[model samples]
Target chain A: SCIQFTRHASDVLLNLNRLRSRDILTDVVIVVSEQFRAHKTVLMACSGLFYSIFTDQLKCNLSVINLEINPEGFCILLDFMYTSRLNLREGNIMAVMATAMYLQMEHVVDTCRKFIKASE
Target chain B: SCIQFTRHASDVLLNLNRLRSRDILTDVVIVVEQFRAHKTVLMACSGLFYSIFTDQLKCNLSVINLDEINPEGFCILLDFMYTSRLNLREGNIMAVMATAMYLQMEHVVDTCRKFIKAS
Candidate 1:
């Protein structure tokens, strides 16, 4: 589930981001710098961190869950959140690892650990 | 109606894998030789799934083998379901096309043709 789900999960998140930006189906707004948007159901399926934050607050309303993430780091997390794979070299791995850890993205966490180990 | 509804569908299916093990939010249970699936939000994506899940909430965990179902091909189906992507090149797309047709998964069958002919 971890490895297999990573790409599809990330792909859907990307689709949600695209749709929300176009105002077609923006159920959740996860703000990093701009109003990065997504679907509630898709978000819930992908991340417990986002799931808990929004369910507690955005059942029937718009959400701006303060990820408080830097735009670049968040951009990385957003893709990782959906796809479970991080496309980076050694430079951004650590930053992405920290964000994935905080967000409780298990697959991303494992990828980080695995990547770090192999590089060492 | 999602612009990429297929991709969303596939992702939800994969997410079910993660949630099925832990969360009690599981609502459907599919039984195969070595598979178990429980769901919601799946009632609309595929005709077979809609037929299996619609208007009935009491018959889950019942007679739905679909065991002949190829997990790998199904994986591709999910890939197609999520991104309209058919992960086959030389020898696999036809296999996926067959499964998608049997499962009554739309867009996948069509996309299979699209993938094949586009090359």
Candidate 2:
């Protein structure tokens, strides 16, 4: 009844990430230790933390969001959300784990756990 | 080398389409007899849309009024933009093909081409 193209989602997300990289049509700016610009749609769609933040009646209208999370970990998390590529290393593993937990991203948290257990 | 989650794209795809349905955080609406969607999704999928959104306007715009477009075909195409699931059948194949050509979605056009030839 329907055709599901295998590469469609990945291609779409990949281009969207490219748009994000170019700072095109990005609606909100996320401020951690590092500043980043992204579409609120993609951010809310990807992370429960952002979904909660953007869905709030009062907070939804704000253009800039400041978070007190680990900047390096959050960086990797954002990268994963956009490109579906989660890059973790020994130096930043703990931060990524804690930040993923804080953001209520179970998949990222689980991956971090697996990464840690495998390394151990 | 890199850790890739198999479901990550699909999960994000589903959630984003959910947002699209709810009309949440949608930056642009492409209207062909009253269909609405996010510009990011539209542009990512179609070169024609990308050209209009980026080259002509250069940024945010509220509504894109599309004329001479099949509303039914446009609706299906718009749904596929986010969900990546295209519903094709004997009834709508021609409509989808025309609209896909208009939108410059080569993938959709190619799929339609094969679907046409097979039928």
Candidate 3:
């Protein structure tokens, strides 16, 4: 018989996030004016920008990357990557969407569009 | 309501596992006759490994040798860790169980016990 655990993925991600919170097992630093330290595996999994940087393109140094994105927007997106929760605000939505687009995070971009339409 | 992508966790993990299979962004090598994995995912999955990796905790060690586990069994266990699906067979069940036991994977061990009881 084959057994599948439905919650396994979420559980594992949450645990990894917890480790991230404590700065454990983190391998890379993301700079957007300020800096964000995170795991390359998690970042690559979440963002096409990171995946391309780490896996295929190898555009920048693996350990540290300086990005020309809104720091707050990048933080919001990074939090969403770890927690699956995206916070949208009228003031910050533009920056968030732009950052998401730049990172090739279609889901975040779509969610931002839906938020905009709903607010209208 | 705020946006929460329900499938995001599973999707990210699947992507991470793909990276792991390719040896990309993997910080630690788990050697049970050449089975490899990411430390974060493996620690998240198994308590024994978590303890081992962290016990060597102070320094980030790159390689871990789990000599007691059978190679095939370790691969099966790792597949479950990454995919959350366990394939059990009469022929390979013992090796899998023993490896699961050593790894302190209660869920897999419990499932193996249930399979045994039901059979």
Candidate 4:
């Protein structure tokens, strides 16, 4: 009976260790970040032509800095991705452009720059 | 055996019809053509906050007008969506922005407007 108890306890500990390892793996996995997850979700939702334009035509790169938090800018980006509208204010325009530039998103950067220049 | 063959052929025909119907459903379903697709793909390819920015922050709309597409403008949009870079001639900037605006994609519109306005 003592031996059986010891075996059961060891089995439980092993199972717990496995679960803990899986959790750590998921957390530390850079590819599993929210942005990447969102992007993938959008891609799966899109159709053939849009997928081609984005993947083949645009040749957009996935930058690490894009993962950083900038709620206002991030929100703007999200809205555009979904609806393609931007309600930017004159004051926030420059900062948004700068962020786009920093992210190396050329179309977005160019668009932002154009808006600021026009305002000036 | 003949009966089984007839049933199989009928099944194949039915499947073919279903496939045709699906194609029609997708083809007629319009929303900014490929812009939405590009956006969705970019969102998927992007990580963390950038995805957040593209999906939540930006308020661009999708429009249809494949004919008026400026090669350079379309190219720039496509390039940025995939690679996050733009390699365009100075003259082509306004054309791209105008196209974006016409499509009613405000972010693309604003971005184009800003680029031209600044230029």
Candidate 5:
């Protein structure tokens, strides 16, 4: 596991678009400030915020998202959804929760709301 | 954090060579059979063992019993904690998810609550 030499082989097949260097299985993309190409199947594994729009043909994945959170915060959030890393804290919770609300990841918002209320 | 053209940047996660070569500031030893890691460094990254390693007398550490976990999955999770890289391709994610669920590491599910429900 320390060596990703073997890991890259599988990633190439599933999600990595070598030439494009991002997602290929994606039927649509999520455009916050930058492009986030995503597979609907993968997207469905997480949220329905895009269920209707993602299914629609005319919608733009990029233009579709205009976030209150900074683009970097969404980047961190996406990494967590696709994977996980840091524990949320007072310093970063608001930004992460903001994107969570927009993405309709209400569980995220719920956690934040509870923590904020408790702390206050 | 790109691959530096002029110099090789040591990977923050996979490169355990540094761990072996240097004298780490390890206050605690997590003895998982064949694996040995500095509890301090590992704790600094994730809240797992840090439920309050607030003092030595309180948390005199001899971390063990890691055999219960799926190696590949925990390795993936630990890698993320140590370094923000991903290898969560199809075959491995389930095992990774199992341990993740057991631990319920905050952002893993909490942040994706709606996504989990919708899925």
Candidate 6:
């Protein structure tokens, strides 16, 4: 999914780069620019050196608490534009909590944290 | 990336299911329930058996214009929490365009279409 989205985004950027000054000055360019910026922000917020490291270490720390969100949280976070809410399940709540915490989405992190506590 | 995220989401759900009724009765339960429902919807929309089949045929159908979103689109959509821009490059633009179109993300699809035209 990450690779696919990246390819598509790259296409948009290339086109934007190709536009002449006149085209770039148009409303279309502005709209595309804004969308690009928003997507870039989301990426910046979600991806980091930490996540890359975390992913590498994920299997080894599967038993750790608050280490990762389950598939549900990943689906929710991945499809946030399509779905406004998150789904925390037993299998991966810790991961989700960790991700929310990492992203600094405190409300989501807190909710996941409380949920994790109750499960324990 | 998809597999990693799926595993994480499954873990969260399992934890929620283990909670006792008293715990479930709390605001956390309500929150968790809502979150689960939302995630289910997203998953259904994002992952289809047909897409899996489509992927099998992707390489053979390579030359079709606007058939798929390149790697950049996948990265943008998948890493939305991390990045906002969809970077479209020459090598894989069509693949990305196809993906946005298949997902029925009209805005994203149209944006790619316009970009493709200009490129």
User: Highest DockQ, which number?
Assistant: 2
lDDT of 1: 0.55
How much of the true A–B contact set does each candidate keep? 0.07, 0.73, 0.78, 0.00, 0.00, 0.00
Per-residue lDDT of candidate 5, residues B45-118 (tens digit): 44455444434466355554554767776677655544444346556766776665654455443423433344
Candidate 5 vs 6: which has more lDDT: 5
What do the candidate models score in CA lDDT, each in turn? 0.55, 0.86, 0.84, 0.38, 0.47, 0.38
Top candidate by TM-score: 2
Kindly report which residue stretches of model 2 are placed more than 4 angstroms away from their true locations once superposed. B56-59
> Candidate 3's interface RMSD, please?
1.6
Interface RMSD of each: 11.5, 1.0, 1.6, 28.5, 16.8, 16.9
What is the CAPRI rating of model 5's predicted complex? Answer: incorrect
Q: What is the C-alpha lDDT profile of model 4 across B15-119, one tens digit per residue?
A: 223333333212111122343232222222223212332353454434333554666666565444333344445677776676545444444555555455564
- The per-residue C-alpha lDDT of model 3 at residue A63 equals 81
Residues A1-120 of candidate 4 have per-residue lDDT tens digits of 001112222222232233333331111111212432233222212223223333442443332212344456654543333333444667666656654444444455566666678778
> What tens digits encode model 2's per-residue C-alpha lDDT throughout A1-120?
489999999999899999998887788989986888899988888888899999999996999999878888888888988998889998898999998888888887888788899979
lDDT of 4 at B101: 57
Per-candidate TM-scores read 0.46, 0.96, 0.92, 0.27, 0.35, 0.25
- Which lDDT tens digits does candidate 6 get at residues A80-107? 3122346667776776776566555555
lDDT of 5 by residue, A50-93 (tens): 54454455754433343335666576566544432324667767
RMSD of each: 11.1, 1.4, 1.9, 27.6, 20.7, 20.2
Interface RMSD in angstroms for candidate 6: 16.9
Judging by lDDT, tell me the better candidate of 2 and 3: 2
lDDT at position A88, candidate 2: 90
By summed lDDT, which 10 consecutive residues of candidate 2 chain B come out lowest? B53-62
**Candidate number of the best lDDT:** 2
> How accurate locally is residue A93 in candidate 3, as Cα lDDT from 0 to 100?
93
Docking class of 2: medium
Enumerate the candidates' DockQ scores in order: 0.08, 0.80, 0.72, 0.01, 0.02, 0.02
